[PDB]
Every structure is written in structure tokens, then in C-alpha cells.
Symmetry: C2
Subunit: 351 residues, 2 copies
């Protein structure tokens, strides 16, 4: 395209046919860089997709490894098995795209396009040097006549070599653009056609069934749920209105009679008369035994019951009692006069 | 799973069965958040892939819109046509994944899982308030007896409602985990199966042909290129050794004789004797006309030739001449005694 055998003369016409090419390269670099970055966003996003698909399959396979205080586990494995074969599709694709698309387009924008700019710069440097040389030469008069001529020799010779190679690259660039544009696109497509092929291979109907199946089990699970929430919202309503008259320690004496025939009393009580501060704790009758249990500690014995009677008294508080079958016990305190009676009556009832 | 009708008594055993569930929720949130972020990386990377594929197809379609100073264009359109149908596959998939995968998993981790923490906090607040209430009550002696009892009423009632709803959510959470885990996965897969189906529809053999075709045209283009570079590297060698004895103004007089029979001389020359600085410019004989042309300006006339003789002289420079057919011209300067003669001889030859 660019004639090398026209570089020596270096005519203005020639220098114009260098501009066209040069302008063409500016355009070509601009278009090509745009395509480069788009393909770059493709590649990156593709690997990132590949990686996330893998991590998902990974997590899925660790369900049966979680500390959980069965159809599910077996389920999360087939999904893990199907999502794993897919990851590989993506993993495979990302590799091809890296080798068949990115690399070529990346070398065109790092080697080829650069050399054009590297050469243009060296030629515009050799060109200028000669320019200066010629003037000096011109201003001679009638040895500085050697040195000054020598430079024309050197600068000129440098501009001839420089412009030629430059011309060479610019021509070559003509073949390269066609390739640096078709090659990548061809690779991308071939990559894709193999991607959809491999992926379709694992997406058969025996899977579509499995999927449909679960899709009904989940709707099944959702029905169950909506059903259980309905009966719960009512329970809470029911119990919310029935309990209100019980949130208060001493309830209406006429509607909630001190039951004096219990063979089992259960509830929290405060223990022992030693400030320096008592200790709250749940208590409950049990096979002639009075068991106790602090706030979430998971049910130990405290006193045995085959004891005759049980006094009371206080320490300035209210509703206290005390057992003394074996030797005695600490002083227990109730929260109401009802509670207080039922504690004394139930235990005495316990014989 | 959690019994609501056991909340009023609030026994230590019950409070333990709340821990299990609570521990289970801590685990469940941890596992589920991990799955959430993985699916998030999937979704994002998927849309990003979708977008880059589109932009690529877009750029491709703008080739015939670039300022370029034919099989190619038609080619870049089919690729653009095939890559565009693919973008839609990705575009379609990204939408499904957003609606069928992200949203569900996102609401489980923003609504459901949160409510558990919101409730646990309110219950641990109602629970503590009652705790304090009970003590005050206990320290009464023998109206502050009303206010102090009232609080037990309020704090207790608040703890009963709070714990119940909490129990309710924790149970519901049991159904939800199954769903917030299966639903997303099902959507993702259905999305995928439709993705590969739609994509395969456009990847037929008439395309595989088109691809194979180009793949040979490009190798064809690459052959051509490698071939042209071979003949160029030689040309440059050839011309590099032939030219060396010509880079110097006045070449060997014995090997490059002052040709005095030229009917055409061409080369740069300096013009007019007016410092205040000459002007370099290419000159060339042309149909009895002496044309001139500056550094890249694209070829104007200057003097006519049918002029008798042509003197010379200087202005302190060297190798100058002057024409005077019409009226006269500026003083031209050559770079050598050879150049100088050939300019004077060629023009005189031009009659």
C-alpha cells in the first residue's frame, strides 16, 4: 500500500500519502480500543460468573457439614451436582475466551498498535534532525564544511531507514486489522457454540422432572406454613385474652380459688435469707422430691418430701415458707398469698 | 415446633428449648448469608456479562459508521447479528435470575432473618424488664404497693406477648428456611435450562459453516501478510545498501555523473534571498512548467519554461540559480554542484 521505493526522495506527495495512512491508524486504534475494552468486560464478567457458580455449588455441598441443632440433604446434593456440571461449562468457556479472544485482541492493542506509535515517533525525530541538518548545510559559505555535511549524511540516512520500517509497519497494519478483528470474534463464537453444546448435554428431561417435583414439594411446604401461621395467630389471641387476668400476682380470689388439693405445684420462687441478695429459681414437685432449676441451666434436687408440716415466717419480705424433713431447707418466698398457700398445701398434700 | 401454650409459665426447660432454636437460627443465618452473597456475585456478574455482550454487538454494528480513509462490512454484520441474538439470551436470563433467584433470597435475608433478630431483641428487653419488676415486688414489706405490683402486671404481660410472637416467628422460620433455600435454586435452574435452550436455537450449522469459512479467509489473510513482509524486509535491505552512497549531497563524481540531458529534474530546493530566512520546497519539471510544493500541502505552479538560459550567483550561500522567462523568479538554491548543474541543464534542456 505504502511504497518503500519512494522514501528516499521524500516528496511532499509521498508525505501526504503517509498522512492518510496515519489518519487511518488513528481511527483504527480508536475503534479497536473500544472493541478491546468491551471484550475485556466480557472476559472478566465471564470468569467472575464462572467463579461464583463454583462457590455456589461448593456452599451447597457443605450443607451436610453445617452445625444444625431426610429429603433435604439428598436434594441439596443433586442441585450441587447439576450446578457443578454447569460451573465447568463456564470454567471451560472462560479459558477458551482467554486464549481465543482476549490474548489476540490484547496483543494487537499492546504490540502492533504500539509499534506504530513507537515508529511514528522515531521517524518524526529522524525527520526533524535532518530538517535542521539541511539548514546548517544551506548556510555554509563560499573543517566545519565536513562536520556540517557529515550530519546531512547521518541525519538523512537515519531518516531513510526510519521512514522505511515505519512504512513497512503501516502496510502490515493493513493485514493485521483484518486479523485482529476477525480472529477474536471467531474465537468468541466457537467458544460459545461449544459452551451451549456442553451445557445442553446436562440439561435433560429427567432433570426437568426433578425440578418440577421439588416445585410442588415447596408449594407443599408453603401450604403447610400458611396453615400453621393461621392456627398460631388465633392461639396467641385465645391465650392473650385468657391470660390477662393472670399476669398479676394475686388474681381475683373469687375466680381463681386457692387450690388446696394439688399433688403438684410448679413455679419460680426466691430462696434463702442472706442479703450479704436472694436467688430466683423455678421449683416443681416430683415423686416426693422438690426439684429446683435456675434460669436456663438444664434440673437438680433440693429437698425431699415426706416431711410433716411446714411453717413460714419472713425476714421482712412476704409469702415465705420452709421445709424440714431431712434436716431443713432454705427459706422459700412466693409471689402471692395464693401461691403461698398452694405451696404449703401441695407439699403437705405430698404427705 | 416451639410451644406457645408454655410461654406463660416460662419455665427454665422452656427457655432452653428456646436456645436450641436460637442457636439454630444463628447457624441458619450464617449459612444463608453465605448463599446470599454467592448468588449475588452470580447475578451481578450475569448482568455485567449481558451488558458487555450487548455493547460488543453495538460497536460491531458501528463499523460502517467509522471514519475510514467489501466482504468485511457485510461480515461484521452477521457477527453482529449472531452476537446480538446471544445478548438477548443473557439479557433474558439476567431478568429471570433477578425475579426468580435474587429477590426471594434477598427478602429472606432482609425481612425474615431480620424479624428474628428484631423480635429476639424485644423479647430480651421485655424479659429483663420483668426480671427487675419481680425483684422490686419481692422487696416489698409487711401506694407503692400498687405501683410496684402494677409493673409486674405490665412487664409480665409484655413478656408474654413478646415471647409468643417470637416463638411464632421461630417456628415459621422452620418452614421458611426450606423455601428460602429451594425456591432460589429452583428458579436459577429453570432460568438456566431456558437459557441454554434459547441459545442453542440460534447456534445451527449454517453458522458453523460461516465460521469455518472466515477461519480460512483469515488464514488466507495471514498468509498474504507473512508473504508481503518477506519481500519488504528484502526491499529495505536492497535499498539500504544501494542508497548509502546517495545520502551525501555531493556523491562520488565518477560514479554518479552530472547528467546533462535530463528532460525532468525533481527535488527540494531553497527559495528567495530575504533573511529578514528562506523556504524549503520540492520542485519538479512539468510540461514546460516549474511546479513547487511545500511540506505536505498537496502542487502549485511557480515559473514557466521556454526561457533562454539561466544565470546563477549567490547571496553568500552555494549552488544558486534563477529563471527569467516571463519576468524572472526568486533565487533557487540546490544542495550540490551536481544538483546545481542538473537544475540549470534540465531547464535549459526544457528549451
Amino acid at each position: 500500500k505504502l511504497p518503500i521505493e519512494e522514501t528516499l526522495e521524500d516528496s511532499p506527495q509521498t508525505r501526504s500519502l503517509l498522512g492518510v495512512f496515519e489518519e487511518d491508524a488513528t481511527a483504527i486504534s480508536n475503534y479497536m480500543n473500544q472493541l478491546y475494552q468491551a471484550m475485556h468486560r466480557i472476559y472478566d464478567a465471564q470468569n467472575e460468573l464462572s467463579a461464583a457458580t463454583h462457590l455456589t455449588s461448593k456452599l451447597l455441598k457443605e450443607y451436610e457439614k453445617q452445625r444444625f441443632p431426610e429429603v433435604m440433604s439428598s436434594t441439596l446434593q443433586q442441585f450441587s451436582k447439576v450446578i457443578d456440571e454447569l460451573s465447568s461449562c463456564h470454567a471451560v468457556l472462560s479459558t477458551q475466551l482467554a486464549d481465543a479472544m482476549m490474548f489476540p485482541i490484547t496483543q494487537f492493542k499492546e504490540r502492533d498498535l504500539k509499534e506504530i506509535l513507537t515508529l511514528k515517533e522515531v521517524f518524526q525525530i529522524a525527520s526533524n534532525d535532518h530538517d535542521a541538518a539541511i539548514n546548517r548545510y544551506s548556510r555554509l559559505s563560499k573543517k566545519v564544511k565536513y562536520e556540517v555535511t557529515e550530519d546531512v549524511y547521518t541525519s538523512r540516512k537515519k531518516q531513510h531507514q526510519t521512514m522505511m520500517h515505519y512504512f513497512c509497519a503501516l502496510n502490515t497494519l493493513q493485514y493485521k486489522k483484518k486479523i485482529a478483528l476477525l480472529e477474536p470474534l471467531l474465537g468468541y463464537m466457537q467458544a460459545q457454540i461449544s459452551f451451549f453444546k456442553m451445557g445442553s448435554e446436562n440439561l435433560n428431561e429427567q432433570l426437568e422432572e426433578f425440578l418440577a417435583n421439588i416445585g410442588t414439594s415447596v408449594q407443599n411446604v408453603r401450604r403447610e406454613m400458611d396453615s400453621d401461621i393461621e392456627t398460631m395467630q388465633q392461639t396467641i389471641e385465645d391465650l392473650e385474652v385468657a391470660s390477662d387476668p393472670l399476669y398479676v400476682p394475686d388474681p381475683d380470689p373469687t375466680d381463681f380459688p386457692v387450690n388446696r388439693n394439688l399433688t403438684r405445684k410448679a413455679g419460680y420462687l426466691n430462696a434463702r435469707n442472706k442479703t450479704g441478695t436472694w436467688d430466683r429459681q423455678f421449683y416443681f414437685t416430683q415423686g416426693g422430691n422438690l426439684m429446683s432449676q435456675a434460669r436456663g441451666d438444664v434440673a437438680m434436687d433440693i429437698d425431699n418430701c415426706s416431711v410433716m408440716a411446714v411453717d413460714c415466717e419472713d425476714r421482712r419480705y412476704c409469702f415465705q415458707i420452709t421445709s424440714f424433713d431431712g434436716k431443713k431447707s432454705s427459706i422459700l418466698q412466693a409471689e402471692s398469698k395464693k401461691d403461698h398457700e398452694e405451696w404449703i398445701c401441695t407439699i403437705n398434700n405430698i404427705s
